[PDB]
Amino acid sequence: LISLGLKSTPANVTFSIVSASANSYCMIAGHSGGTVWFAATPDKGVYKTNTAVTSSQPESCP
């Protein structure tokens, strides 16, 4: 994604691509001083999860 033009992960943001395939992805991101982890999938779009950023990041899209 960075090769194609996505910038460096922002300061204090931890971003992960949890899984991907020919047809779907799940991405998770959160700021150490935000409120909650956010998830992105091609069906649900970008949305906020129930998990606080002080907890360990979700292992999958809620």
Ligand X SMILES: *[C@H]1O[C@H](CO)[C@H](O)[C@H](O[C@H]2O[C@H](CO)[C@H](O)[C@H](O[C@H]3O[C@H](CO)[C@@H](O[C@]4(C(=O)O)C[C@H](O)[C@H](NC(C)=N)[C@H]([C@@H](NC(C)=O)[C@H](C)O)O4)[C@H](O)[C@@H]3O)[C@H]2NC(C)=O)[C@H]1NC(C)=O
Ligand Y SMILES: *[C@H]1O[C@H](CO)[C@H](O)[C@H](O[C@H]2O[C@H](CO)[C@H](O)[C@H](O)[C@H]2NC(C)=O)[C@H]1NC(C)=O
Q: Are 19 and 26 contacting, i.e. CB atoms less than 8 angstroms apart? A: yes
Least distance in angstroms from the C-beta of 19 to ligand Y: 5
Neighbours of 44 (CB within 10 A): 11
- In sequence order, the β-bridge partners of residue 14 are 30
Site string for ligand Y, 18-47 (x = CB under 6 A): -xx---------------------------
Structure tokens at 50: 């129930």
Binding-site ranges for its own copies (CB under 8 A): 4-7, 10-12, 22-24, 32-33, 35, 41-47
Binding-site ranges for ligand Y (CB under 6 A): 19-20
